[PDB]
Write a protein that binds this ligand. Structure first.
Ligand SMILES: COC1=C(OC)C(=O)C(C/C=C(\C)CC/C=C(\C)CC/C=C(\C)CC/C=C(/C)CC/C=C(\C)CC/C=C(\C)CC/C=C(\C)CC/C=C(/C)CCC=C(C)C)=C(C)C1=O
Ligand SMILES: CCCCCCCCCCCCCCCCCC(=O)OC[C@H](COP(=O)([O-])OCC[N+](C)(C)C)OC(=O)CCCCCCCCCCCCCCCCC
Ligand SMILES: CCCCCCCCCCCCCCCCCC(=O)OC[C@H](COP(=O)(O)OCCN)OC(=O)CCCCCCCCCCCCCCCCC
Ligand SMILES: CCCCCCCCCCCCCCCCCC(=O)OC[C@H](COP(=O)(O)OCCN)OC(=O)CCCCCCCCCCCCCCCCC
Ligand SMILES: NC(=O)C1=CN([C@@H]2O[C@H](COP(=O)(O)OP(=O)(O)OC[C@H]3O[C@@H](n4cnc5c(N)ncnc54)[C@H](OP(=O)(O)O)[C@@H]3O)[C@@H](O)[C@H]2O)C=CC1
Ligand code: SF4
Ligand code: SF4
Ligand code: SF4
Lengths: 45, 178, 318, 115, 109, 325, 156
């Protein structure tokens, strides 16, 4: 009987993600302020 | 090899779009809303808490729990007053007195473990040459008094008889690693 | 009959606070990936009563170094004002219609800080004094801008009576014309109720407990009931001022239900924020309120002084 | 009357809660329990010692700003006037004066806490 | 070789300064820590502890004793040492054993 | 090698008795009827296996026999300052002591130590004292060698004496019979009484005798209360009040379902003057040097002060005036 | 049925309140405080049983002595135990607190927190599992359930 001992699989394990991923927001800024000003003017009217 | 966790990037990136984006970030609380969104995402996940009394966590065959003294299948007790257990116990929780039994056998007359003094390390069960003293899988043996936590030979033997099937199964599973 | 109305107002509010404690604990648990209470009764609905009975049956403390009169008045005043603030709220009809209901709210809420101040000073304990002075600083921070925000939004209502907001918002939320003021009002209420991120008057991490560190059993229960009653009250005030619910003269219950839904949402948002953000520093809170809210608050106050005149939209009086 | 009644009822409810809290539980009193609290070690000095205030200037500024709110609060009735030009000029002047005071303190570093 | 004091006279000067300091501090200690003893008892205890080392003749040993006494004095001046730590100087939990030969014979060996 | 059964451990004096026995290292048996929560303070008074708590009931004599089974010494501290709905002075001071003494005699306990009271007399104006005298007689009848201890008033942290008097501040002024005068009090220290009992558990000469544990000094009630209020820097406003009015006030206060603040018998015993030693042994016979009230009053009375006077020295109060009657 | 029956039901309500809401004091001395943190953690979640921590001793019921008690620390532990208002219970978790543990024969360790305060429950282990500490808390709750203070008062 040959040895049976805990070892990684043949070839190896799949790659591990460790590097930070923090997806960035798509909202522009001009659009946000435009929505704000539009709401303000509509409410004032 | 090293990396900069927080290094200055630039101090002149000026265009209207960048300035307005920064102003919107400051005045609209973009990252704060992002954190709120993360917490909202967590609210809708299945909680990891388990119904503990009726649902217990996993435990390996090597789990070091309440001690027990085993018997041979014929009902004979394995203990032969080695006192290797007593000599190796780092916390000096084991106390053994033995006499030559009426059979002419080497057996213990008293074997006391101070469970309030033991550090549950397993050195006794790994130094025992005949697998006499073991740490079963029991982790629920709290008491209302201190003296109940001073185990004697009868208590340890009763624990062994009570958990014999599980202790034997754990030893069967793990002994090849030992 | 007026007594029956008093009961039907007070008792539901107390029960609402009692179960708001449970809802807070459960929402925090679920956001944090745990369950929260669910043993004490079905889904833990008996938890607030268990806690109240335990606290009121626990031995109350009379520390040797305390000034007993103030030590005991402070919790009583806290709960008294917490309950009193509910009186003039229209939903849609107030229990007590006041011409200056908003000024009543301001004066009562401002007086409520003296409960914390006197409790912390009468505890005659160092951490209690720390908590009292942090309450002083917090009040200085937020009170200056809260009044100006209320004035700026009231220049569109036309009067100080709360009941007039219902007819002002008969076609559109006051949030839309004045969402910038709504944000600062929300932050100011968050700071006023001594809630995170502005949970500094009782800051467990820095002060073991703040003002109420020498308080056990019933007096502590009084403080903790006043806090949550005030939370619900402030969210309801936001719901009435901004987020004007629907009102139809023939369907008062529709207004009641819309108001309850919106106030519940805003209170759950309070708890959500508490679960999300870290705490402030009691100088950073004052600097925020004085260097980013007060300038913009003054600017918007003068903007809303100008707006009715140059739009010819001056509100009516009475 | 409808207001005195409700306020008195709230006061009586709070007082009854206090009375129950104090006269229901079983009480065991001794000096070690009744001593002041400080993380398990005896306080080294009284809590009545002076406790320096690092925002005293901002407090005495808050007084004046509170009186400014006092002056600004009659605006809902003020805007109901036929002299809208005068009312607007006065409101703008008052608000700008308040802003100038705040800005002067800010620049002179009055809003910064003492160290 | 001298730790501080060249000779026993200088060591004694240091010891007497320490005794002055402890004698001065006893009243403030009692008042602040709310001990259930009298100033007379505190100063008697200070004297007893000082005299417990009256047999020493080495200037270096006297210097060590004075240094450790100054350390205890600082610890007491500041309220680092609490009432439970200070009332240990009085041993008000000890039942004295006798020095009589017959009494010792009766109790133990 | 002492095994001692303390029948009133869960009390003001029982805790000290148990503490001193544990320090001596003798096995202690505590028969209790209260809740298990009320004995936690005794729980830590002895090393492993030294103390044995067992439940008992005065009605059930099997419990008494079980308690006194393997005991060499039986200390009986049972008592009560008011007549309970189920137990009255007669029961508390005669029936239960007699039953305990007879059970102990039958079991074969070497020593029995019964605690009565200094002014326990058959003619006393006080119901409790009159019952205590009969209890002494019955105990010495059913256990002829039983030791009898007769403490005066006992003062300590958990006492009903100095605390009782200092609590008169809640009533503004202090009513006294004859304005305190014509009343001599000789209070003893609880630690001294406990040490005396424990020492009597082994003193060879103590068997069969009656002791009177009394403090060193005798004060007039007026001067004693004045000293108490001086220690608890409170305003002392004494005024006279005839004994019948005092007893009516005690009757009023004794109607509470719980622990009465005061009672007719309590005022009677407060106002009955202590007797003189008169040839009884005393603490010095057992080797306890009585501790004066002046030394140990601060540790009892400091918790009744306001912040202003909390940190005041023992020497800031003028000592009382001791009579020599 | 009887005033005795009513008193028993009242005391059952009393004990239900006490055991359903018991607020351990934020107190941890050594390793074992880490397993206490893990029992707080999501997997076991003490809060599910109504057990929420409180920093002030004035607003606590049960003191969980979790870790070695040294001679320099014992007075402070006793002070916080005293300043806990009654009723108050003590759970000694870990071997250091049950007895002396690994450091039983040391010059600076109190051989058992029960030498300083009267202990209600003992949790063996080094450290005990978070499930073991939870079992100890349940045992304490059963102890509180069997109290009968009011029945004792009525009989008295
Ligand atoms: C060393 C330190 C350690 C080992 C500790 C480590 C532990 C941890 C890290 C986990 C704990 C850490 C945290 C940050 C926990 C955070 C979450 C919380 C604190 C949850 C919030 C819980 C709180 C604030 C407890 C307050 C709970 C209560 C039940 C308050 C009292 C409520 C009431 C009395 C409501 C009932 C009121 C009534 C019925 C009154 C109504 C009256 C009438 C109707 C007449
Ligand atoms: C909506 C939820 C909030 C409700 C809050 C109000 C709670 C109402 C609870 C009703 C139950 C009332 C019983 C409370 C008893 C609490 C104090 C206690 O347990 O002491 C028992 C006391 C103690 O009796 P005891 O004197 O025999 O106990 C031993 C005494 N020592 C400690 C001195 C040895 O018994 C009573 O007399 C209580 C009677 C109350 C009526
Ligand atoms: C433990 C200590 C507890 C201490 C408790 C202290 C309670 C204080 C509660 C906060 C009170 C702060 C606000 C001041 C009271 C409100 C005054 C007010 O708003 O108006 C009173 C009202 C008249 O207002 P109005 O209706 O607009 O004009 C008449 C046409 N309707 O109608 C009236 O004229 C009624 C006048 C009495 C107002 C209530 C005062 C109660 C104080 C009791 C003490
Ligand atoms: C049409 C002509 C006229 C037009 C006029 C209109 C002009 C446009 C005005 C746009 C401005 C909108 C008002 C927004 C006010 C925000 C004030 C501000 O700038 O934020 C301050 C602070 C930022 O922090 P900091 O980076 O330190 O800023 C100083 C930098 N040296 O930011 C903070 O205060 C955040 C700290 C507190 C966080 C609390 C947590 C809140 C969580 C989110 C709540 C979401 C719900 C809010 C809605 C409530 C509705 C009732
Ligand atoms: N000033 C004093 O304290 C003086 C005391 N004495 C005597 O010393 C003895 C101790 O009294 P003390 O302990 O000081 O005050 P306590 O009232 O505390 O003594 C009461 C003791 O008796 C027990 N007890 C009372 N009634 C019963 C009962 N019906 N069945 C069983 N046990 C009962 C109590 O148990 P629980 O409380 O758990 O029911 C408690 O252990 C008494 O005999 C007293 O007269 C002598 C002189 C003066
Ligand atoms: S426990 Fe094992 S090693 Fe020790 S005496 Fe018994 S058989 Fe021998
Ligand atoms: S597990 Fe370790 S400490 Fe415990 S008895 Fe065995 S050898 Fe001793
Ligand atoms: S009992 Fe064990 S795990 Fe717990 S603190 Fe002590 S050594 Fe660490």
């Amino acid at each position: 009987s040959k040895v049976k001992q805990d070892m990684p699989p043949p070839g190896g394990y799949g790659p591990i993600d460790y590097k930070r991923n923090l997806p960035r927001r798509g909202l522009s800024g001009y659009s946000m302020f435009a929505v704000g000003i539009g709401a303000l003017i509509f409410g004032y009217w | 090899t090293y990396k900069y966790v927080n290094k200055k990037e630039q101090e002149s990136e000026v265009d209207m779009k960048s300035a307005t984006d920064n102003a919107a970030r400051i005045l609209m609380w973009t990252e704060l809303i992002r954190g709120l969104g993360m917490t909202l995402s967590y609210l809708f996940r299945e909680p990891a808490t388990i119904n503990y009394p009726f649902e217990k966590g996993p435990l390996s065959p090597r789990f070091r729990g309440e001690h027990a003294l085993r018997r041979y299948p014929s009902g004979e007790e394995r203990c032969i007053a080695c006192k290797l257990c007593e000599a190796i116990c780092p916390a000096q929780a084991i106390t053994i007195e033995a006499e030559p039994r009426a059979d002419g056998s080497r057996r213990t007359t008293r074997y006391d473990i101070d469970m309030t003094k033991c550090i549950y390390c397993g050195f006794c069960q790994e130094a025992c040459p005949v697998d006499a003293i073991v740490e079963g899988p029991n982790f629920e043996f709290s008491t209302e008094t201190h003296e109940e936590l001073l185990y004697n030979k009868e208590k340890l033997l009763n624990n062994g008889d009570k958990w014999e099937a599980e202790i034997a199964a754990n030893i069967q599973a793990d002994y090849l690693y030992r | 009959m007026f007594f029956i109305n008093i009961l039907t107002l007070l008792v539901p509010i107390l029960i609402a606070m009692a179960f708001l404690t449970l809802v807070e604990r459960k929402i925090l648990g679920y956001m944090q990936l745990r369950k929260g209470p669910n043993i004490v009764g079905p889904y833990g609905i008996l938890q607030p009563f268990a806690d109240a009975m335990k606290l009121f049956m626990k031995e109350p403390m009379r520390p040797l170094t305390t000034s007993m009169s103030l030590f005991i008045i402070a919790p009583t005043l806290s709960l008294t004002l917490a309950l009193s603030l509910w009186v003039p709220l229209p939903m849609p009809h107030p229990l007590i219609n006041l011409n200056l209901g908003i000024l009543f709210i301001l004066a009562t809420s401002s007086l409520s800080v003296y409960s914390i101040l006197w409790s912390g000073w009468a505890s005659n304990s160092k951490y209690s004094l720390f908590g009292a002075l942090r309450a002083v600083a917090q009040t200085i921070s937020y009170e200056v801008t809260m009044a100006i925000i209320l004035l700026s939004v009231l220049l569109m209502n036309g009067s100080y009576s709360l009941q007039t907001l219902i007819t002002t918002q008969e076609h559109m939320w006051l949030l839309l014309p004045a969402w910038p003021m709504a944000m600062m009002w929300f932050i100011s209420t968050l700071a006023e109720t001594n809630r995170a991120p502005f949970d500094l008057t009782e800051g467990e991490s820095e002060l073991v407990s703040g003002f109420n560190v020498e308080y056990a059993a019933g007096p502590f229960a009084l403080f903790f009931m006043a806090e949550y009653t005030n939370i619900i009250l402030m969210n309801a005030l936001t719901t009435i001022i901004f987020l004007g619910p629907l009102y139809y003269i023939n369907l008062p219950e529709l207004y009641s239900t819309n108001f309850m839904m919106e106030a519940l949402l805003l209170s759950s948002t309070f708890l959500w924020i508490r679960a999300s953000y870290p705490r402030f520093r009691y100088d950073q809170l004052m600097h925020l309120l004085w260097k980013n809210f007060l300038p913009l608050t003054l600017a918007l106050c003068m903007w809303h002084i100008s707006l009715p005149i140059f739009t010819a939209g001056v509100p009516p009086y009475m | 009357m409808n207001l005195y009644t409700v306020i008195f009822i709230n006061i009586l409810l709070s007082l009854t809660l206090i009375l129950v809290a104090f006269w229901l539980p079983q009480m065991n009193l001794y000096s070690e329990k009744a001593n002041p609290y400080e993380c398990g070690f005896d306080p080294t000095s009284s809590a009545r010692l002076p406790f320096s205030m690092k925002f005293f200037l901002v407090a005495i500024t808050f007084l004046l700003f509170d009186l400014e709110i006092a002056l600004l609060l009659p605006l809902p009735w003020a805007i109901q006037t036929i002299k809208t030009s005068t009312m607007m000029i006065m409101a703008f002047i008052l608000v700008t004066i308040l802003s100038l005071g705040l800005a002067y303190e800010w620049t002179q570093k009055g809003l910064e806490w003492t160290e | 070789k001298p730790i501080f004091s060249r000779d026993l006279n200088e060591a004694k000067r240091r010891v007497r300064e320490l005794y002055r300091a402890w004698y001065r501090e006893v009243p403030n200690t009692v008042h602040l820590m709310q001990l259930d003893i009298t100033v007379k008892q505190g100063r008697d205890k200070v004297r007893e502890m000082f005299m417990k080392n009256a047999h020493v003749t080495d200037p270096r040993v006297v210097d060590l004793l004075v240094i450790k006494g100054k350390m205890e004095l600082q610890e007491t001046i500041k309220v680092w040492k609490q009432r439970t730590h200070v009332m240990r100087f009085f041993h008000e939990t000890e039942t004295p054993r006798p020095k009589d030969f017959l009494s010792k014979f009766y109790m133990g060996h | 090698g002492v095994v001692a059964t303390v029948f009133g451990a869960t009390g003001f004096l029982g805790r000290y008795v148990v503490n001193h026995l544990g320090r001596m290292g003798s096995q202690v048996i505590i028969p209790y009827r209260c809740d298990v929560y009320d004995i936690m303070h005794l729980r830590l008074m002895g090393d492993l296996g030294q103390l044995t708590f067992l439940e008992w009931d005065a009605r059930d004599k099997d419990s008494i026999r079980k308690a006194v089974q393997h005991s060499n010494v039986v200390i009986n501290l049972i008592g009560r300052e008011w007549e309970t709905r189920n137990f009255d002075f007669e029961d508390v001071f005669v029936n239960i002591p007699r039953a305990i003494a007879q059970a102990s005699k039958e079991a074969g306990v070497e020593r029995f130590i019964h605690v009565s009271h200094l002014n326990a007399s058959m003619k006393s104006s006080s119901k409790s004292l009159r019952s205590k005298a009969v209890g002494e007689k019955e105990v010495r009848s059913v256990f002829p060698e039983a030791i009898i201890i007769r403490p005066s008033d006992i003062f300590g942290r958990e006492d009903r004496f100095l605390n009782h008097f200092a609590n008169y501040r809640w009533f503004l002024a202090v009513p006294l019979v004859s304005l305190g005068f014509k009343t001599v009090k000789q209070p003893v220290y609880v630690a001294d009484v406990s040490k005396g009992i424990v020492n009597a558990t082994k003193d060879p000469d103590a068997v069969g005798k009656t002791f009177a544990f009394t403090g060193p000094n005798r004060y007039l009630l007026f001067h004693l209360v004045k000293y108490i209020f001086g220690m608890t820097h409170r305003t002392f406003i004494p005024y006279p009040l005839p004994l019948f009015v005092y007893s009516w006030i005690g009757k009023l206060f004794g109607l509470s379902p719980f622990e009465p603040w005061t009672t007719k018998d309590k005022v009677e015993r407060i106002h009955i003057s202590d007797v003189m030693p008169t040839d009884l042994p005393g603490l010095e016979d057992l080797g306890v040097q009585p501790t004066p009230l002046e030394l140990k009053s601060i540790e009892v009375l400091r918790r009744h002060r306001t912040y202003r006077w909390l940190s005041s020295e023992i020497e800031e109060t003028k000592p009382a005036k001791t009579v020599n009657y | 049925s009887r005033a005795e029956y009513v008193v028993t039901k009242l005391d059952d309500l009393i004990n239900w309140a006490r055991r359903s809401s018991l607020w351990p004091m934020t107190f941890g001395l050594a390793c074992c405080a880490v397993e206490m943190m893990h029992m707080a953690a999501p997997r076991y979640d003490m809060d599910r049983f109504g057990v929420v921590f409180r920093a002030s001793p004035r607003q606590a019921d049960v003191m969980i002595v979790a870790g070695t008690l040294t001679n320099k620390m014992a007075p402070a532990l006793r002070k916080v135990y005293d300043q806990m208002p009654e009723p108050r219970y003590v759970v000694s978790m870990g071997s250091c607190a049950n007895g002396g543990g690994y450091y039983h024969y040391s010059y600076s360790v109190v051989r058992g927190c029960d030498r300083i305060v009267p202990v209600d429950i003992y949790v063996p282990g080094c450290p005990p599992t978070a499930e073991a500490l939870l079992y100890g808390i349940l045992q304490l709750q059963r102890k509180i359930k069997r109290e009968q203070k009011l029945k004792i008062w009525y009989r008295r």
